[PDB]
Design a protein around this ligand. Structure first.
Ligand code: NA
Ligand code: ZN
Ligand code: ZN
Ligand code: ZN
Ligand code: ZN
Ligand code: ZN
Ligand code: ZN
Ligand code: ZN
Ligand code: ZN
Ligand code: ZN
Ligand code: ZN
Length: 523
């Protein structure tokens, strides 16, 4: 009476696990490995999964979709990978009903990842138990196709691309049809995701495929407008893979058919992204990502925001989201005894600004190095490189998306955040998922303070669209974003009234959105 038992879904009965929590009757029902789509076929759209007889034991995580290992010398996963997982919190009196539902989309540059995430201190990163039980929401995680198998495209009808985005959509659609049986409110689905998953969340809100499916969304460190999201020249990347696996490149239709019948592991390992000794910035080697296909993504994402007019929206970034990419593009910021120079930074800036030529490289270099005269230290110079990467890859796109969402809003509310701390300890996913509570030996009291606050805001927002209103108290009133106030919440280990701030790096935003765009394009 106080737990689910066998659950009736469209595909048949599903049985998970009940885990007692605390001493007084609370618990959580855990389902792992529920199929939401058929075994995949290489470079084909996802299809319904056939029903089953009897009761499916949803007891263990299922295989991720085929992807390269981090060494890039081998693969793991499987073509049969479109599975999802569900945590349902339970009180001590009766079974939960009408709960908000949060669907997580993982990141990993569209190239890697799974619904459970990295395992550390005997705990998977995306284990939904802490969010579910602390915020009284249902949490869903799931796998989607990544790499060439997720995103290879010719930019035309021969190989339209976006397979991995369709997989995400199929999991959302399944949740809408089925989650009420688990005690969820299907009218109240919130998507949330980080990095590539934040851009995915964004793209899902913009696609007409999701009309009437999504109530709210949270983009963490990535939006559809980030420069690494849309591949402008997919046929170049598809030809590269075709040459490497022995397919002819002259006819796009014959090339597409040959790629579809190539060993999926050879497609996956065809291109290795190099991380050392690179001619262009790390961005340039981001290949197998979403495309504008005229279908799932009907137009450039910037023109699609009418589709999210009634989707409440949080978007924010991490203080040093650009750090990883800065480290690759300028290794000197790692070694304490190696100098970043004006010449190194000019070069990096010029690569990012080539469509605006010499004039665009200089205006950008000059604005970012203005502070170097009075503060020429390496601490300031290296922080400038990180800020530059954070700005162009994450912060500026996120601010443009916030503005477009606010400008197209009907009933939708808009919220902005900046996360600042002190995987790296600086990353916000582990606090969103409550790892400082799930594995407390790895974390300090301040970490559990940060995590407690983020879960309160995230799950209040899921319940009501208002991060200040719900089952949890919050430390700072989070003011909805408008163009007038341009307010963002600064999330740190000590929050109070002054944590609600405004005009985040506004001179740099204005530089990129007005000054830099007002420059002539060069060829
Ligand atoms: Na757990
Ligand atoms: Zn199956
Ligand atoms: Zn696994
Ligand atoms: Zn297989
Ligand atoms: Zn009801
Ligand atoms: Zn659909
Ligand atoms: Zn490039
Ligand atoms: Zn160049
Ligand atoms: Zn992150
Ligand atoms: Zn900490
Ligand atoms: Zn207010």
């Amino acid at each position: 009476q106080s737990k689910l038992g066998a659950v009736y879904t469209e595909g048949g009965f599903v049985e998970g696990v009940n885990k007692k929590l605390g001493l007084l009757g609370d618990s959580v029902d855990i389902f792992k490995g529920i199929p939401f789509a058929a075994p995949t076929k290489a470079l084909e759209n996802p299809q319904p999964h056939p029903g089953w007889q009897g009761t499916l034991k949803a007891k263990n995580f299922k295989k991720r979709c085929l992807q390269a290992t981090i060494t890039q010398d081998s693969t793991y996963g499987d073509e049969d990978c479109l599975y999802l997982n569900i945590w349902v919190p339970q009180g001590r009196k009766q079974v939960s009903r009408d709960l908000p539902v949060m669907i997580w989309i993982y990141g990993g540059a569209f190239l890697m990842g799974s619904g459970h995430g990295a395992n550390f201190l005997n705990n998977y990163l995306y284990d939904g138990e802490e969010i579910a039980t602390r915020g009284n929401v249902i949490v869903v995680t799931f796998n989607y196709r990544v790499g060439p198998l997720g995103f290879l495209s010719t930019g035309d009808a021969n190989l339209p691309g976006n397979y991995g985005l369709r997989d995400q959509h199929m999991a959302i659609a399944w949740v809408k049809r089925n989650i009420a049986a688990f005690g969820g409110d299907p009218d109240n689905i919130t998507l949330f995701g980080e990095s590539a998953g934040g851009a995915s969340v964004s793209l899902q809100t913009l696609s007409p495929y999701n009309k009437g499916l999504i109530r709210r969304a949270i983009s963490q460190s990535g939006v559809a407008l980030s420069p690494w999201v849309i591949q402008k020249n997919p046929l170049f990347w598809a030809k590269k893979v075709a040459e490497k696996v022995g397919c002819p490149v002259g006819d796009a239709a014959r090339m597409a058919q040959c790629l579809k019948v190539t060993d999926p592991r050879a497609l996956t390992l065809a291109y290795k992204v190099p991380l050392a000794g690179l001619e262009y910035p790390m961005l340039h080697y981001v290949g197998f990502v979403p495309v504008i296909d005229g279908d799932f993504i009907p137009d450039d994402p910037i023109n699609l925001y009418a589709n999210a007019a009634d989707i409440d929206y949080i978007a924010g970034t991490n203080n040093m989201d650009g750090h990883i990419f800065a480290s690759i593009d300028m290794p000197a910021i790692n070694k304490g005894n190696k100098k970043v120079t004006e010449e190194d930074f000019y070069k990096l800036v010029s690569e990012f600004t080539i469509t605006k030529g010499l004039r665009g490289a200089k205006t950008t270099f000059d604005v970012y190095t203005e502070s170097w005269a009075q503060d020429p230290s390496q601490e300031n110079k290296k922080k400038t490189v990180v800020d530059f990467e954070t700005d162009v890859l994450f912060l500026v796109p996120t601010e443009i998306a916030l503005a477009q969402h606010r400008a197209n809003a009907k009933s939708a509310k808009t919220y902005a955040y900046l996360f600042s701390h002190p995987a790296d300890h600086a990353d916000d996913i582990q606090y969103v998922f409550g790892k400082p509570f799930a594995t407390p030996t790895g974390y300090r009291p301040q970490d559990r303070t940060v995590s407690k606050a983020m879960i309160a805001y995230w799950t209040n927002f899921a319940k009501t669209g208002d991060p200040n209103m719900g089952d949890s108290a919050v430390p700072t009133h989070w003011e909805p974003y408008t163009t007038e106030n341009s307010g963002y919440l600064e999330i740190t280990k000590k929050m109070g009234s002054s944590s609600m701030k405004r005009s985040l790096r506004t001179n740099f935003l204005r530089y990129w959105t007005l000054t830099y765009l007002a420059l002539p394009t060069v060829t």
